[PDB]
From a paper:
Based on the density, both FMN molecules appear to be unbound to the adjacent C189 residues, and the folded helix of the LOV domain suggests crystallization of the OFF state. While we would expect a primarily closed conformation in solution for the OFF state, the observed open form could be explained by the tight crystal packing around the fluorophore, as the surface‐exposed dyes from the two chains face each other in the center of the asymmetric unit. Overall, both the predicted and the crystal structures show that the HaloTag and LOV domains are tightly arranged and connected by a long helix, which ensures efficient propagation of the conformational change to the HaloTag in close proximity to the fluorophore.
By incorporating a light‐responsive protein domain into HaloTag, we engineer a tunable, photoswitchable HaloTag (psHaloTag), which can reversibly modulate the fluorescence of a bound dye‐ligand via a light‐induced conformational change. As the genetically encoded photoswitch, we selected the light‐oxygen‐voltage 2 domain of Avena sativa phototropin 1 (AsLOV2). Exposure to 450 nm light induces the formation of a metastable photo‐adduct between a cysteine side chain and the FMN cofactor, which leads to structural rearrangements and undocking and unfolding of the Jα helix.
Residue numbers in the entry: 3 to 434
Write the structure that this text describes.
């Protein structure tokens, strides 16, 4: 299993009148590697990465102020507050040059620090980072829905060849493929020799006409088992009425009951498609409600929805109870939940807040002209970084090597720590 323990002795340092906790392991003479977590996590999100780096390099992972084992003073916990504390933390440890490993709001911290101190950053690994998000349409409404008891997939017709970017657990059961064997491919891989080609044209024509179609079709499991697949597809449109996704709903079994009962099956998958489409904007409207005072604080501070509801929906795989208690630990007291609510209100989406938008633009500009080595991880569908944006950055950023970690949402270290860690370790070998 992926590791659930946290086998690191605590270290502490006084920072602007407040105590911060950090992990500090590995050798001590060379360039240190600084790990910056974001919301709603802590140095715990790095627990299975650091062991890949520790044999060769020093590993420093602080808990942001207000989080983890660090003190919890009375602040607004604005991004500017975290900036002051991290500035002071780095100076308090005496750090000179560093390599950065950064995630979420840790990455706004790391990129903002590098822009102001470029000759001290010898390389940057980043994943799911803070970028200006132009429109709420780019926020994936489907994030974290893999366990919904409904057989459906989402395709992104704007990626080459309309690949699958989401597959519910049910769809894995039906086809016998794992999520890593499904995402990023066109759903036509389920077809085989006895698939009626005239039916495949009916699907191809309808998709080209951006229109719904319902068919029954011969498909194959990963193990070669033929089965009748009764499935319905239909587009989803964004706020401009343009198709940004297709939704597919499949019915379970080799059927063979695809007659008379077919009229009930057809009605069931059509009804499921409509119900999912009806709910998609409410799924996405949750973060918008977070970004409000009276409702957002009742959800996140009074109810703890960010820990109990958003955090598991940022991992494709299920988090165990042990792992959920580690993330719960700093926030058992409702009064300590301020940084959970202020972070999403700082996110630069659709131009607000203007001050954070400007700041992230400034360091994005820096990163585009900086020769510093860059290692970027991304998953499907991701949350902050959709695949298309990962692809764009892989070509825009100089000295950038991009790594696809497989299925992933926001806490990519939790879906595939062994790849992220080993990739970081080989990368570090190629540096100065
Ligand atoms: C730096 C950037 C950070 C990255 C952020 C990552 O973003 C990931 C996606 O964002 C999701 C935002 N949206 C919500 O959080 C949300 C919305 C609605 C619901 C809902 O129930 O309708 C919930 C929600 C729960 C919500 C609250 C819950 N309590 C409060 C008590 F403490 C328990 C429980 C669940 Si629940 C254990 C009954 C639950 C289950 C669920 N199905 C399980 C799986 F099959 C999907 C879906 C939603 C919930 C959650
Ligand atoms: C949302 C969606 C779901 C689909 N699901 C399946 C499926 O489950 N099985 C299948 O054989 N084809 C499925 N397809 C069809 C293929 O992806 C493809 O569009 C079809 O084979 C016609 O295209 P082609 O002639 O270029 O192969 C789906 C298409 C969409 C848009
Ligand atoms: Cl956030």
């Amino acid at each position: 299993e992926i590791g659930t323990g946290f086998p690191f002795d605590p270290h502490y340092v006084e920072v602007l009148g407040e105590r911060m906790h950090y992990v500090d392991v590995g050798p001590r003479d060379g360039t240190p590697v600084l790990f910056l977590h974001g919301n709603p996590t802590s140095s715990y999100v790095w627990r299975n990465i650091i062991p890949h780096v520790a044999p060769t390099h020093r590993c420093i992972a602080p808990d942001l102020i207000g989080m983890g084992k660090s003190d919890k003073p009375d602040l607004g916990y604005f991004f500017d507050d975290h900036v002051r504390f991290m500035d002071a933390f780095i100076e308090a440890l005496g750090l000179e040059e560093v390599v950065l490993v950064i995630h979420d709001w840790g990455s706004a911290l790391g990129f903002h620090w590098a822009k102001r101190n470029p000759e001290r950053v010898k390389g940057i690994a980043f994943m799911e980072f803070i970028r200006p998000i132009p429109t709420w349409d780019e926020w994936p409404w489907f994030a974290g829905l893999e366990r919904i008891e409904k057989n459906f997939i989402i395709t992104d017709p704007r990626l080459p060849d309309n690949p699958i970017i989401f597959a519910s657990d049910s769809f894995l059961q039906l086809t016998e493929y794992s999520r890593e064997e499904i995402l990023g491919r066109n759903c036509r891989f389920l077809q085989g020799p006895e698939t009626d080609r005239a039916t495949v044209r009916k699907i191809r024509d309808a998709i080209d006409n951006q229109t719904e179609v319902t068919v029954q079709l011969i498909n194959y499991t990963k193990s070669g088992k033929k089965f009748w697949n009764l499935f319905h597809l239909q587009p989803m449109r964004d706020q401009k009425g343009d198709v940004q996704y297709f939704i597919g709903v499949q019915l379970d079994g080799t059927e063979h009951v695809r007659d008379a009962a077919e009229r009930e099956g057809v009605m069931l998958i059509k009804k499921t498609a409509e119900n999912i489409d009806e709910a998609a904007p409410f799924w996405r409207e949750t973060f918008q409600a977070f970004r409000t005072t009276d409702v957002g604080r009742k959800l996140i501070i009074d109810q703890n929805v960010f820990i109990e509801g958003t955090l598991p929906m940022g991992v494709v795989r299920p988090l165990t109870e042990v792992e959920m208690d580690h993330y719960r630990e700093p926030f058992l007291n409702p009064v300590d939940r301020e940084p959970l609510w202020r972070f999403p209100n700082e996110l630069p989406i659709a131009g607000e807040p203007a001050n954070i938008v400007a700041l992230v633009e400034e360091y994005m500009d820096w990163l585009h002209q900086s020769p510093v080595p860059k290692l970027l991880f991304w998953g499907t569908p991701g949350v902050l970084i959709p695949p298309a944006e990962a692809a764009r950055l892989a070509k825009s950023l100089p000295n950038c090597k991009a790594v696809d970690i497989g299925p992933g949402l926001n806490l990519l270290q939790e879906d595939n720590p062994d790849l992220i860690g080993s990739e970081i370790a080989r990368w570090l070998s190629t540096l100065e």
